[PDB]
């Protein structure tokens, strides 16, 4: 990997979220290394670890996921894995 | 238009989620839902996939089977029709 | 209740994390309505939905959770549930 990141998705409705977010990840040419989804209280929640063999622009990715999350009524965060290693 | 269940079984999950979800996307299929478990000496995953276009299950079964061999896992794809 | 939030945690190692984070939530006088944890690739992750019957200050909580997170080498995010409910 040149890039790795953890993506967090929080919303109220689960409907179509896994398809939307996985499709977006794929649109951006990122690999899904792992994924998990959990209903928690009244919320549907989803986390994915993603990567690419090329350096990416987190400024762009963060804004792009944020804007995409908004279209689906969910909050999306992306964190570079560089924080841990 | 198309809906299916993909089941994956192998001994080691290293790289399996990326490989299989990557193959799914290469084939233009949507991942509607996904789950994984470690089971005995095995890792398993399942995904429900779909497309707005008709698909050829004959081709897909063969393609996922061949792809599975490259990763040392067994991949089945079954149409949603069969779980009727 | 008057406050509800979703807390998310990411780090490399699970050792001590559940105890540290649940312990911090109780110190802050917050209720855990629900919780879940998973290993995800090489990371330990947990998520919790918390609430209080008193209004809270998310400016303070965000800072406090991030600061506490650092003591445990984990990234802690908190999001008010109001964002998913409120009209505009
Ligand atoms: K939102």
From Swiss-Prot, chain B:
SUPFAM superfamilies hit by this protein: ACT-like
InterPro entries recorded: ACT-like_dom_sf (IPR045865), ACT_dom (IPR002912), UPF0237/GcvR_regulator (IPR050990), UPF0237_ACT (IPR022986)
One Pfam family from the record: ACT_6
Taxonomic superkingdom: Bacteria
Matching CDD domains: ACT_1ZPV (cd04872)
Residues of the ACT domain: 5-78
Family: Belongs to the UPF0237 family.
Subunit organization: Homodimer.
Protein name as annotated: UPF0237 protein SP_0238
Organism of origin: Streptococcus pneumoniae serotype 4 (strain ATCC BAA-334 / TIGR4)
